[PDB]
Specification:
The complex is a heterotrimer of chains A (274), B (99) and C (9). With 274 residues, chain A is α+β, with helices and mostly antiparallel strands. Chain A has four helices and 17 strands. Chain A has an eight-stranded antiparallel beta sheet with strand order 4-3-2-1-5-6-7-8, with helices on one face. Chain A is globular, with a radius of gyration of 23 Å. Chain B is mainly beta. Chain B is 0% helix and 47% strand. Chain B has no helices and nine strands. Chain B has strands at residues 6-11, 21-30, 36-41, 44-45, 50-51, 55-56, 62-70, 78-83, 91-94. In chain B, the strands form two sheets. In chain B, strands 1, 2, 5, 6 and 7 form a five-stranded antiparallel beta sheet that branches. In chain B, strand 3 and strand 4 form a beta hairpin. The N and C termini of chain B lie far apart (30 Å). Chain C has no helices and no strands. The chains are: A alpha+beta (274), B mainly beta (99), C little secondary structure (9). Chain A binds chain B through residues 8, 10, 12, 23, 25, 27, 32, 35, 37, 48, 92, 94, 96, 98, 117, 119-122, 190, 192, 202, 206, 231-232, 234-238, 242, 244, and chain B through 1-3, 6, 8, 10, 12-14, 22, 24, 26, 28-29, 31-34, 52-56, 60-62, 65, 67, 98-99. Chain C: It is found in: Cell membrane; Nucleus; Cytoplasm; Cytoplasm, Stress granule. Chain C: Belongs to the DEAD box helicase family. DDX3/DED1 subfamily. Chain C: This is ATP-dependent RNA helicase DDX3X. Chain C: The modification N-acetylserine is found at residue 1. Chain B: It is found in: Secreted; Cell surface.
């Protein structure tokens, strides 16, 4: 199906405790493949997936160099942002960036991404046209003006439509045995008496990849959206994910409830009962 | 703005007393990123706990997985202790093999 | 693989 590559940058200032720490991680879909940490004894872009290891020294040297430059640029940005908001040098602040590309089954660019957040709030984003910006406030407008004058959007467009998609395609091929393999959820229902009057039915999905999944409870064929407890999808630690959905049911009425599971690893959606 | 962490404690595989497994503490939806996470065995901190590289979700909130190899039993109690700027006191979440 | 465009906010 469709695929994505994403880089996630986080820089956090820490007045009195050195310069802002820069962390970078790279993902293809739900699989991390690289990491960089400016606090590391010897900061280097490092492999986090088996299929990226085959890349040569030039790859690792070039990407390390880019990460080191980005470490410095983020520190400049943090200084600028502090000023844009009239903030003191005493506080700690966070700058986040995510960027990358989405491709369809034919490897064609679907969409490009490039956006930033400051202290957890959206700050500025490259629009889907890859040619204009959306600024959240008057501070981000300053950034926008700078980047328009420097024609940053055009440079990003070139990267997103070229380099980004080319690397994603390469990664998808080199790691095809995993990246292009959907692992279906292993599903079952458990029953947990609460009292004489009711019990919990919990629908489980385990060992699935990618993370995207839909679990729903129906009663008499009606979705129980408002009455269903859904936990956040969580990593098992072996590349796969887990999730459950639970409803509280009247004792003896269990058979009126059905769990429905959708996942790209499944030919047809599953229906489960206690 | 600050966001308090969601916390899930669970095992990689279905729990089987006497069989080696992995204990996970998944913290997410938090901001800022500085966070302290301990895994506990019967109230005491487990040494050698590893964690994932810092990443974040579409809403910019951070997530991390802390994990350690463990062999569950009938008696032994496991838990995850989390501290964050949003918390007036460390939060303790006990491992329930049914969740 | 990373973007090589260098521009501070």
């Amino acid at each position: 199906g469709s695929h994505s590559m994403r880089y996630f940058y986080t820089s956090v200032s820490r007045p009195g405790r050195g310069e802002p720490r820069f962390i970078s991680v790279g993902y293809v879909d739900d699989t991390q493949f690289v990491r960089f940490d400016s606090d590391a004894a010897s900061p280097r872009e490092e492999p986090r997936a088996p299929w990226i290891e085959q890349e040569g020294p030039e790859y690792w040297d070039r990407n390390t160099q880019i990460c080191k430059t980005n470490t410095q640029t983020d520190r400049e940005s943090l200084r600028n942002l502090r000023g844009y908001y009239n903030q003191s040098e005493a506080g700690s602040h966070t700058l986040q960036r995510m960027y990358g590309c989405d491709v369809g089954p034919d490897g064609r660019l679907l969409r490009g991404h490039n956006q930033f957040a400051y202290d957890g709030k959206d700050y500025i984003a490259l629009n889907e046209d890859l040619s204009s910006w959306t600024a959240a406030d008057t501070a981000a407008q300053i950034t926008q003006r700078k980047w328009e004058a420097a024609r940053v959007a055009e440079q990003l467009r070139t990267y997103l439509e070229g380099t980004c998609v080319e690397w994603l395609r390469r990664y998808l091929e080199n790691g095809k045995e995993t990246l292009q393999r959907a692992d279906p959820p292993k599903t079952h229902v458990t029953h947990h008496p609460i009292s004489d009057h009711e019990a919990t039915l919990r629908c489980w999905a385990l060992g699935f990849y990618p993370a995207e999944i839909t679990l729903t409870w129906q009663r008499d064929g009606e979705d129980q959206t408002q009455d269903t407890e859904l936990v956040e999808t969580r990593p098992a630690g072996d590349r796969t994910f887990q999730k459950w959905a639970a409803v509280v049911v009247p004792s003896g009425e269990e058979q009126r409830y059905t769990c429905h599971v959708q996942h790209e690893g499944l030919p047809k959606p599953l229906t489960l009962r206690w | 703005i600050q966001r308090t962490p969601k916390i899930q404690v669970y095992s990689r595989h279905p729990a089987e007393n006497g069989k080696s497994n992995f204990l996970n503490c998944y913290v997410s939806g938090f901001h800022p990123s500085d966070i302290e996470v301990d895994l506990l065995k019967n109230g005491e901190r487990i040494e050698k706990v590893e964690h994932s590289d810092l990443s974040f979700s579409k809403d910019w909130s951070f997530y991390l997985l802390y994990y350690t190899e463990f062999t569950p039993t009938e008696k032994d109690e496991y838990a995850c202790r989390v501290n964050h700027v949003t918390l007036s006191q460390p939060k303790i979440v006990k491992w329930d093999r049914d969740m | 693989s990373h973007v090589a465009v260098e521009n501070a906010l």
